[PDB]
Design a binder for this molecule. Structure first.
Ligand code: MG
Ligand code: ZN
Ligand code: ZN
Ligand code: ZN
Ligand code: ZN
Lengths: 79, 43, 44, 184, 576, 115, 55, 49, 420, 257, 64, 48
RNA sequence: ACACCCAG
């Protein structure tokens, strides 16, 4: 509640979330979406992002010090 | 040249092409510092 | 270990500790001969 | 709308920079819906007015219901809502563009999607982006009434040199001295 | 001392902390390769076999990484190291038995760089954002890096022995950053001036001017050879523009298949007459110069740098803003592949016959130079005797220099316009100027008619001797020949006095190139280290490092410069 | 250093395959014939012989990279004619053309040398 | 130095910049450090070795 | 000095070699002509500072 | 009072070899005079005796077909640098774009611009020292304690490699043992790549009186992709592609050009003298004498050379009808083709290619070393750190400047902030 | 069954070159025959050079380069020998290669020209074609060049030393009747030697329903195979490549059933 | 250094024609007719003999 | 000696004769009464 | 350290 930041997902949050998810899945994390034969963890993480199933909460830091906890499934995907 | 006065006067001869050897033997070098941004003696 | 003199082009048979010195003409430039193993050169 | 732009633009230079290309995505709506400009349309002019009013409320730059926030929101998207009301007016849509009801609904949705995609993303280092963009076209001018203009002018302008090289004024005449060479 | 270690360019702070030598980097000479995409880069086999990318072993790729380990560091592609879970590293050029070559989950295999790998490709004066762009690795066997021709403009790289660095990301997080932030398709449109920084250059731009002319027609076999290089092709041969006498396709039909989606754009050719926009043939073009693309199909118009180049609102800019980065990437490759392979048939060249003018043009040029010389002699005679009235604002000598320079510049412009008037449509100097690929209208004037007045330090050739430019002239000679005007052209050959004056303007251009670069590089450094910490925060207020508001919204509107275009306000110009 | 051996342009060692047929899903009855270790010498004649066939709709060849040694021939035929049969008929007509051309050349040598 | 085979001498791979033992291929220690000068000066002339070591 | 082309070839020295360079430690060293301001001459300059 | 002997005497040595210098833009003449000092050829006639540390010798140096009258005086006739090349200025398949050269592979296989690269490795033994002894001897793994990853088998018992033995990267050619204060091993090694055959091995007594040695390593540098080629008018470029003779375009009489350059390299530079040389070369090769390209010869203009070329069955403007090498179709435009003098420059792609995964680090900075000579790493300079900030990629910027350059850990107190 | 019927007419047949005309043929077939002349006709050239002693002023692997470019006659041998990579011997055998031995020592004061007559081959009918002669190296008194060389079988794709063709000229439609090339000023361009136009005329009129039909060849050999043997081996070589492609295609069609 | 065995452009044999070319020039022939008598019709072979310098004559003056 | 340069500055009434090393000279022909002093007898002697 | 030199 009381969220004032942009609901859209910026290009920099798309870079870090996909980077963190690809590193996690390569470390034998449970894949959250059914796969049709993908092996490269980047392509798996893209499939997780397009299916809105990435278990990552983005914490955005406002300048005054307060922070807002946004889950990736709650943001509009720019792609 | 002393014994800090001058430096880089004697060079190893650029023995790569006969045109390069002749060009190196007939070379003139100016004493203006290459860190000077002036352009009056370069034109 | 035989060397070719730079002036007279004669063998010298210099050992490991023998100073560089021609036995015939007295010259101090030596060239090693080509090795006995044969190297294949492609014609390309 | 017109009187505000007369204050903002005194020189009449109407070539401005705005995110959504209104004159082109209208042409997109004509071609994707196969709109015939000869036949009369079926688009209600009051539906245009309510559509533009709803679209203007749906594009937010300064978010908040505060009166200070609402004033900043109106001023931030002022020039875009000038262009949106001018291009999507009832007269031009009924005479020149001739968009239909379904084409107008697609156009309003696509403007909102394009404007929200053009918002500056938080976290972007615009300071380093600006000075790269302001120093890259500093390698494409020639150095030195004569006037300092180029790299020496740029070097002087960002140093704030207390003694210039060629200082100058541009004095304008107010009364009859402007129209007469004798009093000038 | 300690201070000398910490200050200046080679010190500890600027030379070892703000910038430092890195691993997993390669450098070699660049060569063109138009058969790649814009996001693809060619990498030599020895470079790819030397430096590795660490891949974490997972059950998804347990079999593939096991095969790469078994190949070893002797058969590309292969592996160089096995980083264990406990931190031990096993080199593969020294261990013959397979006791420790078995891979389990959690291991890291440093496999060689293969196809589809992501790298950062960088040109060494890194001026703007589009100089650290990310490419995809394609292995092509020779010793050079290969770039597509459309990425040469943002790098400012010619292929004359330029050499550029290739940085390879190591962790999977950095590969994803390069893939979603700094790839080639995502950096087509710069935020500097909201125009595509890329475009079509040189041979592809000159031939697409030839390919979209009205008179070009392709046979049946030529079309299906051209369509083989179309990546986004639907697979259906379009209906020919001519059916019954012989099946012929115009060049605009093939480019209509190249243009993606259903975009709309109206541009103008470089040779568009001014009166055509108000004449009777406004929407039908006699010179075929009004470029319009409607519903993704080229209808009329001849394409040039004003429609396919870096200009704002061009056909590439419309393609990026409508379709996306990936489709525009295919748009760049499909233009370059189809046009170049048609250019194998049409051909393009330049020669002496492209510089020769007929006898009427040479007589007209010589008459204008002789009249201009007589005009300058008249001015000097009117200025020697006290008969020249000084213009207000300047002395008599600067008034005389302004009058002489005005006559000589009008002489160059008149002889320039006379030379390009008598250029045929088959002339190849005109063929690469109206397309804007390389050269300009002043270059044709210098080749054919006259080199023109040549200036050093703004003014004309100074009196380096005692009141003489050269010993071959008389004292106090303010005529055109003595003070630097070159009445000859490059084709006719310069006289020895004019050759020496040409070596002066050429030298002065080179001195300006070296001095400006050393100054602008310091201007660039100072301009950005003052504001490198300025960042748009999450409340959309532009703030610096110490959290002080610089702007309440970025650019006073909150919109980034990538997705903004030049438009026209319709309620500012008309009267009440 | 990175110089490939000169014989990699026309040998197939352990691992490659001379010809592969891939069906094209864009249009019905189309095949993408991928031929390895060849060049424009065979790509040009096959494209031209397929073009003379009045019942073949599309026939074109490309080389993806001159530094590689792969050509790609795409053949699209009428729905009552297999593209693989079109390629076989194009090769067979070219062999019968060249064998007759060789026999007619050999006769003309004998006629020229005899007087 | 190698854990499994301490007796074997370590071969140096200056191109790859690490210490490798030649039996099991395990990389021991850390990255090799060049003892030469980094440039191509912040050091002085050496003491003359035949002259006695003074100051 | 003053040697024919045949005598120069017998000395394993190129006849086309122009000379003009010293040989120090086996490296060919050339003296570049340094340029100085001309001496003994009165000069007037225009220092705008 | 005085008269000039000839106006073409105002030029220097390297600027006197330019044919028709007055038809070129002045920056192009300056660029060629820089490159004329870098052209590869027989630099001296006693190169087989001299042992230089760098030495480039071209196989077939030809005198220019279009020469200047000062070339008889600079001895460019006797010791040329470059080969007359059939150059067609055509816009071919796309590999000559942006100042590049499409080069005939079958020409290169026949000796076109192929040159050797002589490199010398001096080394001397230092008998001085109160304890150290430095002796040429073949090293042994049992005694020496300073070896690294290389093969000590190509040496002889003296300590020198024999001539006629191939060498590669990280190879030993000097058996060099120095006694420890038993003996540690430091020796001279071949640089990265630099494969070749040892030409001759030379041992003397140097000026210091010590035993001296010099090995000249000879390698053939066939022209390949990336070799820098320049004409005599500042038209620098790199070899974009190597097509065989059947793939290059051919004249109707069967002449396939050795070099194809961009038509787009001409107009922004206005190297019209390059066009005149390429048209004078056709007249010189057909009529039979070496042409004249004196800088200020008023008796030689374009129209006179054009009229001479029309008497030999060619087009008077130098164009010819080239056929496409792939499909055999006529090229619709008519390509301007003729003999032009080209030079190969020492700037070669095998001397410049450099890569580094992980290597030696500095003694002071613990950062990768400087330059390919010691297997260094490329500098991620201030301008590059700057651009990654504008991209917004923070982890990649952290990976470059912290993880891939010099990662380190320190222990810090919490009361004070001093290293613990 | 849609193969056109080509006819051959030969105008000039000399020892060094052949001129022939091919009619009723596509452009691509005539172009493919032209590039087979350069790259797909096998001959015998020296490829494996082993130098025992070389005291000449020319280094060893420049002598090997000049030896490989020397053309060896293979008018009836190149068909008999198979490729060295497809043979059964471990390195080289007389059934798949020929051996050349060179042994020249200069003892006379005059300059000894090591020409191609000094290449002694064990095979009596594989000799240098000039046996003036092709110069290899000039020897001063006291300089010795002794080497042995092997010659393989290869074609022009691998190297230019295996190229029998020395300047094939391919020309079609010399009157520009098809407007495949467009002259800016047609009156300037000289008429081709095969042109059949009047002196006042300079360019044939446009032919709408025309295709390239008549081709002119000027195949010239540098030695090695004779002019007539080059074309006869080329049309067999292109037929062998097409027969090999047909065998592999029928194999893959049978595989995918 | 020495005359090439093959012409760079077309591949015609010019290695056997250098000695005959010097013999014709010594017998008071112009360079145009000397090249035409040797059978070089194309200008690519003509430039191979015309532009060649014989550096092997100067190389042989030094003792081996 | 021929390398000695003598310069007359008439507008200042100064005569400067320079003899020291470092001066840079080039040869020129001599023209008197609009005629070269290099007659044909010098070229024929130089041609042999 | 210095010279020379490549690219813009
Ligand atoms: Mg460049
Ligand atoms: Zn001796
Ligand atoms: Zn503490
Ligand atoms: Zn065998
Ligand atoms: Zn030739």
């Amino acid at each position: 509640q009381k969220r004032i930041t942009t609901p859209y997902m910026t290009k920099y949050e798309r870079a870090r979330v996909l980077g963190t998810r690809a590193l996690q899945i390569a470390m034998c994390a449970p894949v959250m979406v059914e796969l049709e034969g993908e092996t490269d963890p980047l392509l798996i993480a893209m499939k997780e992002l397009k299916a809105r199933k990435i278990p990552i909460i983005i914490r955005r830091y406002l300048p005054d010090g307060s922070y807002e906890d946004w889950g990736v499934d709650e943001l509009i995907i720019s792609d | 040249w002393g014994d800090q006065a001058r430096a880089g006067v004697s060079q190893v001869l650029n023995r790569l092409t006969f045109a390069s050897t002749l060009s190196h033997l007939r070379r003139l070098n100016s004493p203006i510092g290459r860190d000077g941004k002036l352009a009056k003696p370069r034109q | 270990m035989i060397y070719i003199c730079g002036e007279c082009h004669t063998e010298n048979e210099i050992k490991s500790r023998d100073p560089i010195r021609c036995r015939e003409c007295g010259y101090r430039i030596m060239y090693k001969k080509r090795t006995k193993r044969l190297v294949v050169f492609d014609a390309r | 709308d017109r009187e505000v732009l007369r204050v903002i633009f005194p020189t009449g230079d109407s070539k401005v920079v705005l995110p959504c290309n209104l004159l082109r995505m209208i042409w997109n709506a004509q071609k994707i819906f196969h709109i015939n400009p000869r036949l009369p349309s079926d688009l209600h002019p009051i539906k245009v007015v309510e559509g533009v009013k709803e679209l203007s409320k749906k594009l937010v730059i300064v978010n908040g219901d505060d009166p200070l926030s609402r004033q900043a929101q109106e001023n931030a998207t002022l020039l875009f809502n000038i262009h949106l009301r001018s291009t999507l007016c009832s007269r031009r849509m009924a005479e020149e563009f001739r968009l239909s009801g379904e084409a107008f609904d697609w156009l309003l949705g696509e403007i909102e999607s394009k404007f929200n995609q053009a918002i500056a993303h938080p976290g972007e280092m615009v300071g380093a982006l600006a000075a790269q963009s302001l120093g890259e076209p500093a390698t494409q001018m020639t150095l030195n009434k004569n006037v300092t203009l180029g790299v020496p002018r740029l070097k002087e302008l960002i140093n704030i040199s207390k003694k210039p090289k060629t200082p100058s004024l541009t004095v304008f005449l107010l009364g009859q001295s402007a129209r007469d060479a004798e009093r000038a | 001392s300690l201070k000398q270690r910490l200050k200046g360019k080679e010190g500890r702070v600027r030379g070892n902390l703000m910038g430092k030598r890195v691993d997993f980097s390669a450098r070699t000479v660049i060569t063109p390769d138009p058969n790649l995409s814009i996001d693809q880069v060619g990498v030599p086999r020895s470079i790819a076999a030397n430096m590795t990318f660490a891949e974490i072993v997972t059950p998804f790729n347990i079999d593939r990484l096991q095969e790469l380990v078994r190949r070893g560091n002797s058969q590309y592609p292969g592996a160089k190291y096995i980083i264990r879970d406990n931190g031990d590293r096993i080199d593969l050029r020294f261990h013959p038995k397979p006791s420790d070559l078995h891979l389990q989950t959690g291991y890291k295999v440093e496999r060689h760089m293969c196809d589809g790998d992501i790298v950062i490709f960088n040109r060494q004066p890194t001026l703007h954002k589009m100089s650290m762009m990310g490419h995809r690795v394609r292995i092509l066997p020779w010793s050079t890096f290969r770039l597509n021709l459309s990425v040469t403009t943002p790098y400012n790289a010619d292929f004359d022995g330029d050499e550029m660095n290739l940085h390879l990301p190591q962790s999977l997080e950095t590969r994803a950053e390069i893939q979603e932030l700094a790839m080639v398709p995502r950096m087509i449109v710069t935020p500097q001036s909201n125009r595509p920084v890329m475009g079509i250059v040189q041979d592809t731009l000159t031939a697409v001017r030839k390919f979209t002319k009205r008179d070009v027609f392709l046979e049946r076999g030529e079309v299906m050879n051209l369509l083989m290089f179309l990546s986004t092709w639907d697979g259906k041969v379009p209906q020919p523009a001519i059916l019954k006498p012989r099946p012929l396709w115009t060049g605009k039909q093939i480019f209509s298949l190249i243009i993606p989606g259903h975009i709309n754009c109206i541009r103008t050719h470089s040779t568009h007459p001014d009166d055509e926009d108000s004449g009777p043939y406004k929407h039908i073009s006699p010179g075929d110069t009004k470029v319009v693309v409607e519903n993704g199909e080229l209808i009329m118009g001849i394409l040039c740098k004003k429609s396919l180049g870096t200009s704002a609102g061009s056909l590439v800019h419309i393609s990026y803003l409508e379709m996306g980065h990936d489709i525009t990437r295919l748009f760049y490759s499909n233009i370059q592949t189809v046009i170049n392979n048609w250019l194998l048939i049409e051909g393009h060249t330049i020669g002496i016959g492209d510089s020769i003018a007929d006898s009427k043009t040479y007589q007209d040029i010589q008459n204008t130079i002789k009249k201009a010389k007589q005009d300058v002699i008249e001015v000097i005679e009117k200025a020697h005797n006290n008969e020249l009235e000084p213009t207000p604002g300047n002395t008599l000598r600067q008034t005389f220099e302004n009058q002489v320079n005005r006559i000589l510049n009008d002489a160059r412009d008149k002889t320039g316009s006379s030379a390009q008037k008598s250029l045929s449509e088959y002339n190849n100097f005109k063929s690469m100027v109206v397309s804007g690929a390389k050269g300009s209208k002043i270059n044709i004037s210098q080749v054919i008619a006259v080199v023109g007045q040549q200036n050093v330090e703004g003014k004309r050739i100074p009196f380096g001797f005692k009141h003489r430019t050269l010993p071959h002239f008389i004292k106090d000679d303010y005529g055109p020949e003595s003070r630097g005007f070159v009445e000859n052209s490059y084709l006719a050959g310069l006289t020895p006095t004019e050759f020496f004056f040409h070596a002066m303007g050429g030298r002065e251009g080179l001195i300006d190139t070296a001095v400006k670069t050393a100054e602008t590089g310091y201007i660039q450094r100072r301009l950005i280290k003052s504001m490198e910490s300025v960042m748009v925060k999450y409340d959309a207020t532009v703030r610096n490092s110490i959290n002080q508001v610089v702007q309440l919204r970025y650019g006073e509107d909150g919109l980034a410069g990538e997705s903004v275009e030049f438009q026209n306000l319709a309620t500012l110009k008309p009267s009440n | 250093m990175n110089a490939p051996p000169a014989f990699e342009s026309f040998l197939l060692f352990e691992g490659e395959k001379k010809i592969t047929i891939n069906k094209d899903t864009k249009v019905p009855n189309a095949c993408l014939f991928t031929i390895n270790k060849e060049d424009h010498t065979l790509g040009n004649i096959i494209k031209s012989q397929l073009l003379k066939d009045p019942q073949v709709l599309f026939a074109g060849y490309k080389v993806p990279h001159p530094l590689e040694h792969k050509i790609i021939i795409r053949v699209q035929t009428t729905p009552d004619y297999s593209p693989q049969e079109a390629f076989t008929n194009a090769i067979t007509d070219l062999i019968s053309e060249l064998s007759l051309l060789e026999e007619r050349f050999r006769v003309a040598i004998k006629d020229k040398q005899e007087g | 130095t190698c854990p499994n085979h301490p007796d074997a001498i370590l071969v140096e791979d200056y191109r790859a910049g690490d210490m490798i033992c030649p039996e099991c291929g395990l990389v021991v220690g850390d990255r090799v450090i060049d003892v030469g000068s980094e440039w191509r000066s912040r050091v002085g002339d050496s003491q003359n070795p035949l002259l006695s070591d003074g100051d | 000095n003053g040697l024919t082309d045949r005598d120069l070839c017998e000395l394993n020295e190129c006849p086309l070699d122009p000379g003009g360079y010293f040989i120090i430690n086996g490296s060919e060293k050339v003296l570049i002509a340094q340029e100085k301001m001309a001496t003994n001459t009165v000069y007037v300059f225009a220092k705008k500072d | 009072t005085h008269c000039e002997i000839h106006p073409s005497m105002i030029l220097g040595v390297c600027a006197s070899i330019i044919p028709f210098p007055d038809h070129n833009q002045s920056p192009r003449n300056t660029y060629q005079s820089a490159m004329g000092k870098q052209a590869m050829g027989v630099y001296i006639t006693n190169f087989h005796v001299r042992m230089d540390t760098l030495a480039h010798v071209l196989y077939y140096p030809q005198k220019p077909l279009v020469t200047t009258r000062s070339m008889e005086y600079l001895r460019f006739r006797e010791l040329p640098a470059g080969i007359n090349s059939i150059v067609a200025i055509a816009s071919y398949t796309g590999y000559n774009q942006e100042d590049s050269v499409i080069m005939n592979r079958s020409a290169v296989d026949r000796g076109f611009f192929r040159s050797v690269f002589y490199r010398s490795y001096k080394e001397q033994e230092s008998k001085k020292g109160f304890d150290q002894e430095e002796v040429f001897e073949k090293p042994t793994r049992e005694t020496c304690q300073g070896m690294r990853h290389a093969i000590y088998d190509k040496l002889d018992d003296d300590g020198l490699i024999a001539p006629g033995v191939r060498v590669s990267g990280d190879d030993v050619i000097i058996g060099k043992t120095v006694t420890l204060p038993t003996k540690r091993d430091c020796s001279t090694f071949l640089r990265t790549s630099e494969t070749g055959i040892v030409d001759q091995v030379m041992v003397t007594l140097n000026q210091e009186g010590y035993k001296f040695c010099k090995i000249r390593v000879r390698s053939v540098r066939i022209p390949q992709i990336g070799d820098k080629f320049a004409s005599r008018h500042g038209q620098k470029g790199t070899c974009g592609i190597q097509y065989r003779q059947e793939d290059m375009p051919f004249t109707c009489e069967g002449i396939t050009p050795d070099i194809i350059i961009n038509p787009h390299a001409i107009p922004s530079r206005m190297t019209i003298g390059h066009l005149i040389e390429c048209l004078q070369g056709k007249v010189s090769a057909n009529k039979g004498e070496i042409g004249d390209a004196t800088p200020f010869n008023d008796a030689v203009n374009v129209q006179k050379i054009s009229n001479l070329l029309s008497d030999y069955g060619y087009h008077l403007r130098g164009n010819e009808v080239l056929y496409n090498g792939f499909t055999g179709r006529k090229i619709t435009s008519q390509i301007f083709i003729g003999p032009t003098y080209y030079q190969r420059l020492k700037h070669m792609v095998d001397d410049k290619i450099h890569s580094r995964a992980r290597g030696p680090i500095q003694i002071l900075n613990r950062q990768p070393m400087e330059g390919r000579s010691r297997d260094g790493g490329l500098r991620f300079g201030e301008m590059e750190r700057d651009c990654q900030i504008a991209h917004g990629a923070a982890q990649f910027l952290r990976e470059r400047l912290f993880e891939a350059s010099d990662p380190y850990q320190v222990h810090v107190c919490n009361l004070c902030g001093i290293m613990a | 069954p849609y193969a056109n019927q080509p006819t051959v007419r030969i105008t000039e047949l000399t020892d060094e070159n052949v001129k022939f005309i091919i009619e009723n043929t596509d452009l691509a077939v005539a172009n493919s025959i032209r590039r087979v002349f350069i790259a797909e006709v096998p001959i015998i050239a020296i490829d494996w050079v082993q130098i025992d002693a070389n005291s000449s002023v020319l280094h060893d692997e420049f002598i090997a380069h000049r030896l490989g470019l020397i053309p060896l006659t293979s008018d009836d041998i190149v068909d008999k020998l198979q490729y060295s990579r497809d043979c059964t011997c471990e390195e080289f055998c007389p059934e798949c290669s020929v051996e050349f031995t060179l042994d020249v020592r200069c003892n006379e004061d005059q300059t000894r020209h090591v020409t191609s007559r000094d290449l002694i081959s064990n095979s009596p009918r594989v000799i240098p074609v000039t046996s003036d002669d092709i110069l290899i190296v000039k020897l001063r008194k006291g300089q010795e060049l002794r080497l042995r060389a092997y010659a393989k079988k290869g074609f022009g794709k691998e190297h230019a030393k295996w190229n029998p063709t020395a300047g094939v000229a391919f020309e079609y439609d010399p009157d520009n009747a098809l407007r495949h090339t467009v002259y800016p000023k047609p009156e300037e361009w000289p008429k081709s030697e095969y042109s059949e136009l009047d002196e006042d005329e300079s360019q044939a009129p446009y032919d709408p329903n025309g295709k390239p039909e008549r081709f002119y060849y000027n195949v010239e050999s540098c030695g090695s195979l004779r002019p007539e043997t080059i074309v006869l081996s080329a049309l067999s070589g292109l037929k062998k490549k097409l027969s090999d492609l047909q065998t592999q295609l029928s194999h893959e069609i049978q595989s995918d059933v | 250094m020495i005359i090439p065995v093959r012409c760079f452009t077309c591949g015609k044999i010019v290695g056997n024609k250098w000695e005959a070319y010097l013999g014709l020039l010594q017998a008071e022939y112009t360079e145009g007719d000397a090249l035409d008598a040797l059978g070089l019709k194309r200008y690519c072979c003509r430039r191979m003999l015309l532009a060649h310098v014989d550096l092997i004559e100067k190389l042989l003056n030094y003792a081996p | 000696v021929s390398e000695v340069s003598m310069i007359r500055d008439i507008r200042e009434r100064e005569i400067r004769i320079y003899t020291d090393a470092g001066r840079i000279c080039r040869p020129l022909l001599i023209v008197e009464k609009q005629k070269l002093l290099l007659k044909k007898r010098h070229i024929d002697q130089l041609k042999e």
